[PDB]
Amino acid sequence: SYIEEEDQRYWDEVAAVKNWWKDSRWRYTKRPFTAEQIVAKRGNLKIEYPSNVQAKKLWGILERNFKNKEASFTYGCLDPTMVTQMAKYLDTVYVSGWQSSSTASSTDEPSPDLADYPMNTVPNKVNHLWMAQLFHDRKQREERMTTPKDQRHKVANVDYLRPIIADADTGHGGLTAVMKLTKLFVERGAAGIHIEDQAPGTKGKVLVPISEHINRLVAIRAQADIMGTDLLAIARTDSEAATLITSTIDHRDHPFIIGSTNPDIQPLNDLMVMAEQAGKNGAELQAIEDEWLAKAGLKLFNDAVVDAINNSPLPNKKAAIEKYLTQSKGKSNLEARAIAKEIAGTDIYFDWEAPRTREGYYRYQGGTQCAINRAVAYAPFADLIWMESKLPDYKQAKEFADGVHAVWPEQKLAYNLSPSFNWKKAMPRDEQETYIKRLGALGYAWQFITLAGLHTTALISDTFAKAYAKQGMRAYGELVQEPEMANGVDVVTHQKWSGANYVDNMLKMITGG
Amino acid sequence: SYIEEEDQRYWDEVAAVKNWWKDSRWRYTKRPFTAEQIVAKRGNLKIEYPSNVQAKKLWGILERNFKNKEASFTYGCLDPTMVTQMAKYLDTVYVSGWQSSSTASSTDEPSPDLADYPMNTVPNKVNHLWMAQLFHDRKQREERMTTPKDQRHKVANVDYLRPIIADADTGHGGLTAVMKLTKLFVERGAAGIHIEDQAPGTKGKVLVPISEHINRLVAIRAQADIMGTDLLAIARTDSEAATLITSTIDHRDHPFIIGSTNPDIQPLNDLMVMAEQAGKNGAELQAIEDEWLAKAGLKLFNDAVVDAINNSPLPNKKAAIEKYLTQSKGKSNLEARAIAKEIAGTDIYFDWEAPRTREGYYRYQGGTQCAINRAVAYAPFADLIWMESKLPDYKQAKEFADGVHAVWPEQKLAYNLSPSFNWKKAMPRDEQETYIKRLGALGYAWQFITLAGLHTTALISDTFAKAYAKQGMRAYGELVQEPEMANGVDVVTHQKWSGANYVDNMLKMITGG
Amino acid sequence: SYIEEEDQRYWDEVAAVKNWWKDSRWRYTKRPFTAEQIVAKRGNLKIEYPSNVQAKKLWGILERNFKNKEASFTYGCLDPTMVTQMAKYLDTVYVSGWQSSSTASSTDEPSPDLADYPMNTVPNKVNHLWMAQLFHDRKQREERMTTPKDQRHKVANVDYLRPIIADADTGHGGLTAVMKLTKLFVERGAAGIHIEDQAPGTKGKVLVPISEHINRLVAIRAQADIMGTDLLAIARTDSEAATLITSTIDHRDHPFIIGSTNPDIQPLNDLMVMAEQAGKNGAELQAIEDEWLAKAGLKLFNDAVVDAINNSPLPNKKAAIEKYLTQSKGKSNLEARAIAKEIAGTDIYFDWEAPRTREGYYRYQGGTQCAINRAVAYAPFADLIWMESKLPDYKQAKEFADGVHAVWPEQKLAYNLSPSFNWKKAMPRDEQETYIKRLGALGYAWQFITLAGLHTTALISDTFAKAYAKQGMRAYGELVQEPEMANGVDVVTHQKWSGANYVDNMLKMITGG
């Protein structure tokens, strides 16, 4: 009988996933799998994750911004003391892998920004702040509740539960790794996570095929789905600086890979290789590489093929170029290669493997075009898109926005505010106070200053410890105290803030009796 | 043959512990056990802990101060970014259990200052900073070494390896727990640790017998000894605020326990107890306790016994009191009780159990006298002594210093600088800049501002996030940037500081070839 | 408006705790606090813990046993491979602190049975198995679901979700520590936890006042209540072997503390103390202690007072003794002391402090009487009671059962099966096969063989590694293989069991498309 009992259950569990899938949340999400399959990877005990609740907040806050064409910003929170003041003012909290690389490795061994730290490192950072959020919410709700309704109106009401967003890196591995990383993240109170299109352990960026990454975002959703959570996926793309790619394999990456056009020169490897056999220090090598590249004349086929026309006694160029250009939109290389000849008449030479690196990587042409190119593909399996940008440039930002909005006019985008750019000496005050407001009107719903915490911190510690070493207790008072009091910092009141009355009344509660 | 082989080994290992025990380090340390026994708890594989090296630094720096009658200060470091700037200026690093209670629980569940967090919590904080110290020492030593000797003179030479001192709490348990906690601490790069005389899990302080704690310090040394490290033990004492004690048991705690002198009133328990049976909310209870205590007339025997004299038609009081006072110095209660009568003629009434608490604790009289009393006992099995002080008071500090220096003129003391006291509005600028210098001349070799990090942090985050929420990118630049640059903060240079060139050259090293 | 909004919420949250408190689960639980207070320690985000679901299973299975007067047993599971086979046959899983002390310390430093390891050690053991339970439930449910209903009837249906019970030790600290430990435990899938009446860090057992421990059980319930879970509390008691107690303080512990009756001998301390000052190695001390105790004539007042009668030319003893005996049932010592005289006529001498230990502990009289004495008190704030027993003794077990059943006829008890007793050579086969069945009829609903895993393991590894070192690959096959196959062990099929098809179909699910 269990069988008939058992199956119905499966079947009703299914009809529940799907009905869910009907949500306004999913209006833009494309699922390449079925409830039937999702529901089959599920066990007999349904666990409800509380981060889900947070995710529903984000969705909520991110969807008002777009419509209102406004943004919400934040910055990388380093610690609980921090997550604490931030809440008074900002509505999200961001967790950076750069920061955690420098202050939070589960193995406690620090490093420059590389995801050579263990997977859980960031998830763990999320738990770190999530737990304290819930904790400072109990402290406060206690305090309020043990206060005369007629007098609460005066008590604080800081919203400590501000949804968190975390750096998911590359996915820290393969398709399965990605899913584990997701679960971890959905276990420690993450409202949303983000993944890049870089190749794992390559740090001139080395990108990955479009398909592969479309595969991550999907695996990220398959999990969320099993765990039944509305997690926000966020797709970042490293094109605007990328210089390499791992495989010719993706049809859509062809217009962007650099081949060689000197059929008279050796492919690099053997040359480099030989030099390795037969001397050539380190440099020589680099030397020999620098020349070898300045000779090989590299371009993007489409360019090659165009060059070709322009040097042919062929008449009516434009008509030509166009045809080629026009006809070939979206086709494979092997293809374009065909149209080429038919058009031009000869066989343009093009070799995109003689340029490959020591590790066998391909020359790739990064850039806004590259960015929007992937972005647009990513767009269906992602909540927001982020074209990580080297410098705060409004035009680049408008193009990109604009570039993406053509295919998908309802896309939400996120932007990372330059911590390196010299904001004060590189743009007028007005241009500074509104920079975010502005991008926001382009549909940049979420923004953040990645390394803001590391800095605010570093700054203050150098200042203090310095004076301190100079004036002793005077500095504390001057630099530290008056301001604290003067500004009304929570923390000012030591113990209370720690959660003293809370514990207090607690024992009185038990001890009571 | 192994046997004869085996034994000699033991015996030579012994002669090595002892010879070590000869060190100038141990000139003031009293070992109630033998190399023979220490060396028996050791295994066949000798592990050399690198924290030992740090401890030898402290010893070194702490012993110059005393002789020079100067001090070194610090404050509670919260994180690696922090341990980083601090080093430029301060020569030690301190790790507080109050801070870690609020930002670093191995279980990630925060709390007010109680050691209800797991044992490793702080040890782990030590590893946290220790690892990064070694790391920023490699980064820097690399950089220097790959620089023309003729030009290093310009490169930085920050000493990142500044010895760490950690809050060991109570010992987080019993005698064995104490030893485990020690090992953990000696495993993660601790130069010195400190233990208090409070009872574990009682938070009006509840103290512990003098003997018990003399037992911790000893267990702390037994371990250090097995692990063969020069760890610095630091004994703190909670007398100046203590109000309870766990057992009449220690002979030396008698002069300090409060008994009752109203043979006409019930002991509290039953009364409280009954009230528990027969109604009396919560208050009543407290009420009934407040009265019961204001009636029972409590004092310290010696006082009682003195009172007694003063109300006797007995002539020649002073002669009397004195005798009693004089004769009894150091004796047990049961004893004094004897002298009493013989002297006075009656049986003074004194009951130190009718006042005991719900949990069976004894009324105890905290205070400087109490402090120096224990301190002086602790003095033989400890490196420094710390009479944790509520308020920055120079007279209290001189007495205590002075109080301890009588028995032991060569004692090193540590002092905790008040984070709560309103330094700026409570003492003249001169009185502020020298406060430490001064205590230092009393032999307060190590000083620190316990909750300095939490604050410097909190402060800065409220300030930033606030403006930020107001002026966007303008704030970063204004509050954050210019200063950073303006002041020359390490961190300013993002990546370099992360350890980028280091990793860089590393791969070039391998990849090299 | 929020205020009026805010308050109602509190008030409806309250009416929900209480209504819950109405459950058949709580029919025997006594709450010395209010929903009003519980609900005030709660935050604004309700987290539903999935262990709760497990607890509802236990309740369920434990309440059928009692009524049916049957039992369910288990033993200490060491690992996930283990939790795995156990499920095929047993219906609960137990986690021992003795085992985890020897194989699972969060700091990885092993030790004999002492809770000197960090708090989370066991909670963590629970997560360890809980996670894998859910995991082997997904693997299996997948497999079944991707199988023709007409053919599932053949597929396995092992219930991997068997409720877990964990050793909570003493509470690893004070009242707050207890609550943290509880939360941890309720976070990692614990169905029930157990706490003892020993004093933390004393390992001849050193007990704790009845009140203190009644305080733990309560704190354990206060938490469960906030976290809103039906956790099962289980009170263990160390009387039958106890030899000490920390404070005279509990009224009900009086009938059990041993005082002295030789008004002519010194209290121990000073004597021991002196000997410490003035020589007396280690032994002497022990010597001097052994004599000092054999002279001091110790008994339990009530005995003393009785002795007294029997040596009085007082006529009509029985009438006397009785009166005393009868009248005094339940009274304090100070009290009994009163009745005494009035009855007898003299002042019986009795001093229960001259016997106290070096650490100030009291002589206490362990034993079944002691056991039932506490048990009966614990009974109101606990789910099951466990009088930890040295040896499998049915009479002791019937008395105890019986002893407890008088006050509370509906009490559930747990019993720990002796791993040390020589079962095979100490009792007839019949007496062995039914031992559990039998206790079960006394109302011993849950039973377990504490160190069963450690053993089954140890056994097998010595056997294998031995032969192995002797016959190489032959042993594997002989000792290991055939049996595995011969018996049909899950694990036999390597990968499948690992969760291979599960992952497989997973990628096919994504990769699919």
Coordinates of C-alpha atoms in Angstrom, one line a residue, chain B residues 18-189:
Chain B
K18 CA 66.4 20.6 34.6
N19 CA 69.3 22.4 33.0
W20 CA 66.7 24.4 31.2
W21 CA 65.0 25.1 34.5
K22 CA 68.2 26.8 35.4
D23 CA 67.4 29.7 33.0
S24 CA 67.2 33.4 34.0
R25 CA 63.7 33.0 32.9
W26 CA 62.9 30.8 35.8
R27 CA 64.6 32.8 38.6
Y28 CA 61.2 33.6 40.1
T29 CA 59.2 30.5 39.1
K30 CA 58.5 27.8 41.7
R31 CA 57.9 24.3 40.3
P32 CA 56.1 21.9 42.7
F33 CA 56.9 18.9 40.5
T34 CA 59.9 17.3 38.8
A35 CA 61.7 17.1 35.5
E36 CA 61.4 13.4 36.2
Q37 CA 57.6 13.7 36.1
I38 CA 57.4 16.2 33.4
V39 CA 59.6 14.2 31.2
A40 CA 57.4 11.2 31.8
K41 CA 54.3 12.7 30.3
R42 CA 56.3 13.2 27.1
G43 CA 56.2 11.1 24.0
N44 CA 58.9 9.9 21.7
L45 CA 58.6 12.7 19.2
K46 CA 59.7 16.1 20.2
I47 CA 57.7 18.9 18.7
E48 CA 59.2 22.4 18.8
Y49 CA 56.5 25.0 18.9
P50 CA 57.3 28.3 17.2
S51 CA 55.3 30.4 19.7
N52 CA 58.2 29.6 22.1
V53 CA 60.3 31.9 20.0
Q54 CA 57.7 34.6 20.5
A55 CA 57.6 34.0 24.2
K56 CA 61.3 34.5 24.4
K57 CA 60.7 37.9 22.8
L58 CA 58.2 38.9 25.5
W59 CA 60.4 37.8 28.3
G60 CA 63.0 39.9 26.7
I61 CA 60.8 43.0 26.2
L62 CA 59.0 42.7 29.5
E63 CA 62.3 42.4 31.5
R64 CA 63.8 45.6 30.0
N65 CA 60.7 47.6 30.9
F66 CA 60.8 46.6 34.6
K67 CA 64.5 47.4 34.9
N68 CA 63.9 50.6 32.9
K69 CA 60.7 51.1 34.6
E70 CA 58.8 51.7 31.4
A71 CA 55.8 50.1 29.9
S72 CA 54.6 48.8 26.5
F73 CA 50.9 49.0 25.7
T74 CA 48.5 47.7 23.1
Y75 CA 44.8 47.0 22.8
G76 CA 42.5 44.3 21.6
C77 CA 43.2 43.4 18.0
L78 CA 40.0 42.2 16.2
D79 CA 41.4 41.1 12.9
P80 CA 44.3 40.6 10.5
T81 CA 43.8 43.9 8.7
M82 CA 44.2 45.3 12.2
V83 CA 47.1 43.3 13.5
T84 CA 48.7 44.8 10.5
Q85 CA 48.7 48.6 11.1
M86 CA 49.3 48.0 14.8
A87 CA 52.7 46.5 14.2
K88 CA 54.1 49.7 12.6
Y89 CA 53.7 51.3 16.0
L90 CA 53.0 48.9 19.0
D91 CA 55.2 46.0 20.2
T92 CA 52.6 43.5 21.5
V93 CA 49.2 42.4 20.4
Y94 CA 46.4 41.5 22.8
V95 CA 43.4 39.3 22.3
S96 CA 40.3 39.9 24.5
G97 CA 37.6 37.4 25.4
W98 CA 35.1 40.2 25.5
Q99 CA 35.8 41.1 22.0
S100 CA 35.9 37.5 20.8
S101 CA 32.7 36.9 22.7
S102 CA 31.2 39.6 20.4
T103 CA 32.9 38.8 17.1
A104 CA 34.6 35.5 17.1
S105 CA 32.7 32.4 18.5
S106 CA 33.8 29.1 16.9
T107 CA 30.1 28.3 16.8
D108 CA 29.3 31.7 15.4
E109 CA 26.6 32.4 18.0
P110 CA 27.4 35.7 19.8
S111 CA 27.0 36.7 23.5
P112 CA 27.7 39.1 26.2
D113 CA 31.0 38.6 28.1
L114 CA 30.7 35.1 29.4
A115 CA 32.9 32.2 28.6
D116 CA 30.0 30.1 27.4
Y117 CA 31.6 29.9 24.0
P118 CA 33.8 26.9 23.2
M119 CA 37.3 26.7 24.6
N120 CA 39.1 27.1 21.2
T121 CA 37.4 30.3 20.5
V122 CA 40.3 32.4 21.6
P123 CA 43.1 30.1 20.8
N124 CA 41.7 30.3 17.4
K125 CA 41.7 34.0 17.4
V126 CA 45.4 33.7 18.1
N127 CA 45.9 31.5 15.1
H128 CA 43.9 33.9 13.1
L129 CA 46.4 36.7 13.7
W130 CA 49.6 34.5 14.1
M131 CA 49.2 33.0 10.6
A132 CA 48.8 36.5 9.0
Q133 CA 51.7 37.8 11.0
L134 CA 53.9 35.1 9.4
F135 CA 52.3 35.8 6.1
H136 CA 53.0 39.5 6.1
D137 CA 56.5 38.8 7.1
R138 CA 57.1 36.6 4.0
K139 CA 55.5 39.1 1.7
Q140 CA 57.8 41.8 3.1
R141 CA 61.0 39.6 3.4
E142 CA 60.5 38.6 -0.2
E143 CA 60.1 42.1 -1.4
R144 CA 63.2 43.2 0.4
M145 CA 65.3 40.2 -0.7
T146 CA 64.4 40.9 -4.3
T147 CA 65.8 44.3 -4.1
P148 CA 69.3 45.7 -4.6
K149 CA 71.2 45.8 -1.3
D150 CA 72.1 49.3 -2.3
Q151 CA 68.4 50.2 -2.3
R152 CA 66.8 48.1 0.5
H153 CA 67.7 50.9 2.9
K154 CA 64.6 52.4 1.4
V155 CA 62.3 49.4 1.6
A156 CA 60.0 48.9 4.6
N157 CA 61.0 46.9 7.6
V158 CA 57.8 46.6 9.7
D159 CA 58.2 44.0 12.4
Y160 CA 55.0 41.9 11.9
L161 CA 56.0 39.4 14.5
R162 CA 54.8 41.2 17.6
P163 CA 54.2 38.7 20.5
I164 CA 50.6 37.9 21.3
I165 CA 48.8 37.8 24.7
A166 CA 45.5 36.1 25.1
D167 CA 42.5 36.0 27.6
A168 CA 42.5 32.4 29.0
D169 CA 39.4 33.2 31.0
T170 CA 39.0 31.0 34.0
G171 CA 40.6 28.0 32.3
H172 CA 37.4 27.0 30.8
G173 CA 36.8 24.2 33.3
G174 CA 38.8 22.0 35.6
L175 CA 42.4 21.1 36.0
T176 CA 42.5 19.1 32.9
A177 CA 40.5 21.6 30.8
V178 CA 43.1 24.2 31.8
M179 CA 45.9 22.1 30.4
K180 CA 44.1 21.4 27.2
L181 CA 43.4 25.1 26.8
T182 CA 47.0 25.7 27.4
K183 CA 48.2 23.4 24.7
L184 CA 45.7 24.9 22.2
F185 CA 47.1 28.3 23.1
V186 CA 50.7 27.2 22.7
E187 CA 49.8 25.6 19.4
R188 CA 48.5 28.7 17.8
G189 CA 51.4 31.1 18.5

